[PDB]
Amino acid sequence: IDPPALRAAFAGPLDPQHAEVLLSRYDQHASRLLDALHALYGQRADYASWLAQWLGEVGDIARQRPQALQTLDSTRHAGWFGQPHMLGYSAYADRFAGTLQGVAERVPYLQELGVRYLHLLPFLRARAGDNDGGFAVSDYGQVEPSLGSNDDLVALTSRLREAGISLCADFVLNHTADDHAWAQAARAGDARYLDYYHHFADRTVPDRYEATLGQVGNFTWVDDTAQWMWTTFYPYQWDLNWSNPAVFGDMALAMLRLANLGVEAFRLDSTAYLWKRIGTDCMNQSEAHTLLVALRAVTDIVAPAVVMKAEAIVPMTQLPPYFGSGVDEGHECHLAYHSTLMAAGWSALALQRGDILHNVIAHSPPLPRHCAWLSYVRCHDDIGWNVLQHEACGNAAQPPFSLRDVARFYANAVPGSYARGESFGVHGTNGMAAALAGIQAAQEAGDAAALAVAVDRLVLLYAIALAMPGVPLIYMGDELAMVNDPGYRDDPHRQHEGRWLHRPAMDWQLAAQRHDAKSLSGTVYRRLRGLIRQRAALGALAADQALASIALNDPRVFALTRGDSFIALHNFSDQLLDVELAAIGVDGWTLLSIVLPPYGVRWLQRG
Numbered sequence: 001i002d003p004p005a006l007r008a009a010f011a012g013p014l015d016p017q018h019a020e021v022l023l024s025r026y027d028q029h030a031s032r033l034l035d036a037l038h039a040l041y042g043q044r045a046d047y048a049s050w051l052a053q054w055l056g057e058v059g060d061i062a063r064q065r066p067q068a069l070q071t072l073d074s075t076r077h078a079g080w081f082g083q084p085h086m087l088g089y090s091a092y093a094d095r096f097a098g099t100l101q102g103v104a105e106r107v108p109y110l111q112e113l114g115v116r117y118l119h120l121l122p123f124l125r126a127r128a129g130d131n132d133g134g135f136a137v138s139d140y141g142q143v144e145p146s147l148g149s150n151d152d153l154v155a156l157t158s159r160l161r162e163a164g165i166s167l168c169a170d171f172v173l174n175h176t177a178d179d180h181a182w183a184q185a186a187r188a189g190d191a192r193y194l195d196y197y198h199h200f201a202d203r204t205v206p207d208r209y210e211a212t213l214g215q216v217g218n219f220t221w222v223d224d225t226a227q228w229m230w231t232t233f234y235p236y237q238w239d240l241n242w243s244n245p246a247v248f249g250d251m252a253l254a255m256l257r258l259a260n261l262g263v264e265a266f267r268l269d270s271t272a273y274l275w276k277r278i279g280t281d282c283m284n285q286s287e288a289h290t291l292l293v294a295l296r297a298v299t300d301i302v303a304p305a306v307v308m309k310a311e312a313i314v315p316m317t318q319l320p321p322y323f324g325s326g327v328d329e330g331h332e333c334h335l336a337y338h339s340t341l342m343a344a345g346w347s348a349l350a351l352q353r354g355d356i357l358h359n360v361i362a363h364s365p366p367l368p369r370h371c372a373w374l375s376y377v378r379c380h381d382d383i384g385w386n387v388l389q390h391e392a393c394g395n396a397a398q399p400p401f402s403l404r405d406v407a408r409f410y411a412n413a414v415p416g417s418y419a420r421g422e423s424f425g426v427h428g429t430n431g432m433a434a435a436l437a438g439i440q441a442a443q444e445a446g447d448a449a450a451l452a453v454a455v456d457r458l459v460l461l462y463a464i465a466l467a468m469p470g471v472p473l474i475y476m477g478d479e480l481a482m483v484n485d486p487g488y489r490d491d492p493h494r495q496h497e498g499r500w501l502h503r504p505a506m507d508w509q510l511a512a513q514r515h516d517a518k519s520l521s522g523t524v525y526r527r528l529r530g531l532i533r534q535r536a537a538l539g540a541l542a543a544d545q546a547l548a549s550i551a552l553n554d555p556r557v558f559a560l561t562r563g564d565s566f567i568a569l570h571n572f573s574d575q576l577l578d579v580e581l582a583a584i585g586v587d588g589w590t591l592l593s594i595v596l597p598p599y600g601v602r603w604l605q606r607g
């Protein structure tokens with residue numbers, strides 16, 4: 001290639017008053033971007049022409065980045081998202097406040113809770129009719145009309161930015177809705193856009209792939225195109241063909257346009273399936289990581305204030321690659337979801353076994369520089385127990401455990417369970433944190449004692465997430481202990497999707513009740529706030545500080561350490577017990593032997 005010609009193509013559209021800083025970043029990161037793209041598309045005859053054209057488009061979008069954001073790009077330090085004050089919140093814009101303008105007016109609520117990172121679930125234009133809660137995207141560059149306009153998105157991010165909140169948006173880059181403009185153009189016979197997807201005339205090629213592919217069929221017959229379209233998920237979601245550079249180019253531009261609208265974090269959905277190769281399982285392929293490296297390089301150049309987050313619900317042993325492998329470590333995703341920890345938390349609770357958490361943390365891969373975890377208790381999906389398959393087999397320190405038993409416990413399919421979840425290998429579990437922790441059952445039985453204990457269980461699980469390196473993510477309503485919403489059952493087109501059980505509309509009346517320390521919502525809210533408050537004052541919890549676990553011979557306890565000055569002790573049983581200091585080498589001070597009441601948690605500055 002001809003580097004100067006490529007650099008010139010990029011520099012062209014830039015504003016001479018902002019060319020210097022941008023070009024400086026281009027000079028240090030462009031080579032990595034080019035190596036990645038060459039590895040993926042370099043053999044194409046159209047490569048050089050496509051590249052020169054795309055870089056020009058990239059430069060033009062770079063120029064359009066609002067000054068306030070360009071300033072953010074220049075002042076924000078790497079690793080910012082892993083600082084102690086970072087606290088996350090995940091919610092649907094419509095369920096939270098109806099529309100984007102509604103969300104903006106509720107920012108004070110988010111500020112009071114200490115939120116500094118807001119994940120709004122799919123808010124871009126989605127497929128007409130069924131669209132899987134917005135995950136079948138029809139336009140990556142426009143907000144769903146029922147939620148507002150792009151102007152409202154800009155007004156929202158500006159307002160959030162003022163309150164010190166970073167917006168995370170989903171970027172469903174593996175597939176689009178089958179009514180996306182590219183899909184419609186394909187349906188109309190435009191070969192150019194038909195090639196943006198994986199299409200086949202007969203089952204000839206599809207079968208070869210199927211031979212090695214795994215069930216999530218993987219193809220859906222479409223009459224309008226008269227071909228089998230690759231559809232890893234719902235039949236109305238067509239997998240994009242990332243082997244086509246035009247697809248990479250247009251999706252990178254879409255990402256940047258979203259960043260220019262104020263999006264600071266990207267949840268990269270279904271990245272494991274980005275690359276297709278016959279003979280393989282077409283999952284977690286080397287090329288998929290190369291795509292993410294290329295996308296990361298683009299942000300490093302154009303919008304370095306932004307972070308890339310891997311949405312790959314897999315065992316923590318398959319997560320390191322997302323932070324970049326080998327020479328590219330630190331040059332891919334900044335964040336990854338610690339699903340193993342999440343599932344382990346619930347398993348440990350149900351089984352009253354802290355040794356399961358010791359196992360998870362003791363084996364948690366150390367975070368690469370400027371990388372961190374997203375820790376959570378619940379989310380918009382069912383709890384996927386299968387991620388714990390490996391841990392469930394046990395090891396030298398932790399005896400095996402039954403994921404089937406854990407799932408049955410939470411589905412209240414076994415006698416003495418306090419859980420009120422619903423079953424969705426081992427089937428996942430739907431239900432809200434308060435419903436799974438025993439709060440719902442205690443309220444339905446008017447049992448005041450069982451309720452207080454249930455509150456302890458809920459707080460315990462969040463305390464664990466809050467002590468982790470990265471961003472602890474609260475699922476909307478957990479801070480008020482909201483329970484299940486069975487309303488979808490009595491609904492037209494929703495009774496088929498069991499996950500709505502844990503996708504309630506925000507209860508603002510309940511939200512106002514947080515000012516009442518004697519109420520349930522207020523009690524939960526107050527205890528979570530206390531943990532958030534303490535977390536923010538502990539430099540030892542920053543993402544660049546070590547994470548480890550001290551092995552204890554009492555299986556009911558879990559000791560998590562951060563750096564060399566912080567220790568968090570947890571009692572996962574319903575019994576009062578104690579931890580001998582001479583077992584964790586301590587004698588420090590208590591934050592906000594050691595006796596732990598049932599389901600108790602204690603934070604200590606061992607130094």
Ligand SMILES: OC[C@H]1O[C@H](O)[C@H](O)[C@@H](O)[C@@H]1O
Nearest residue numbers: 132135233234269270380381
């Ligand atoms: O493919 C569709 C799926 O994509 C992601 O996994 C979303 O988290 C999930 O809610 C959705 O159903």
